Amino acid sequence: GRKLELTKAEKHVHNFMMDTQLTKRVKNAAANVLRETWLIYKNTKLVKKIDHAKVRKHQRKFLQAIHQLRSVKMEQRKLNDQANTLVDLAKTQLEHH
């Protein structure tokens, strides 16, 4: 039988999307990663004159967007393991007779 094996986890977590909330969270946060990556790059590399108040501002917005994406990814992993728990429970009935 299955003995000590358990449902194999999805390697990367691109799922449970169209949970509109998580999906909307991703698009907005990802757009903001692009926004702040660009603005930090510009303000540290494409100016004659580095405005540090500007860099700090965009660093705050950059870290918040990056960490929002991490939050979604972690929640996806958690949802996936919750689902795998249910599949594992159902698979116990495969142990017969």
Binding site: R2, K3, L4, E5, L6, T7, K8, A9, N15, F16, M18, D19, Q21, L22, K78, L79, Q82, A83, N84, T85, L86, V87, L89, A90, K91, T92, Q93, L94, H96
Partner: protein, 146 residues
């Protein structure tokens, strides 16, 4: 992602573990009860997400064929050797790859659901391969998962 007939009848039995009232449908409320009975604590939103990902007819509950799409996408299993080893490592106080027979008995007779001292006798007989009163838990777990 295909399913033999054999594991349809058995998954029908599986369905009744989830369909608590037996009304033929699994709700977020039933899923919550089941998940908590397994020592987890999904939020309302997480329960709804679980129902939704396999919610074909969009009626907010899971039927049988929706219950099968969840399986078909996940019949693949994998060995648990590493995770089991990590569970033993929790009790490896000195991080040296060993747990003494005495400490294993102490763990098993006091923590979690527990084993009788007689059940522990049998576990240690198998686990202490070298008869030195010490359990190399990596080797023990490898034996059990072989």
């Amino acid at each position: 992602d295909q399913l033999t007939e054999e594991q349809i009848a058995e998954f029908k039995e599986a369905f009744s573990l989830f369909d608590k009232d037996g009304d033929g449908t699994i709700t977020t409320k039933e899923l919550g009860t089941v998940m908590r009975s397994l020592g987890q604590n999904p939020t309302e939103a997480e329960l709804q997400d679980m129902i939704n990902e396999v919610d074909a007819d969009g009626n907010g509950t899971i039927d049988f064929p929706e219950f099968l799409t969840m399986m078909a996408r996940k019949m693949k299993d994998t060995d648990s050797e590493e995770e089991i080893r990590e569970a033993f490592r929790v009790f490896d106080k000195d991080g040296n790859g060993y747990i003494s027979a005495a400490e294993l008995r102490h763990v098993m007779t006091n923590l979690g659901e527990k084993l009788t001292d007689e059940e522990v006798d049998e576990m240690i007989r198998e686990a202490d391969i070298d008869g030195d009163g010490q359990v190399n838990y990596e080797e023990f777990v490898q034996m059990m998962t072989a």
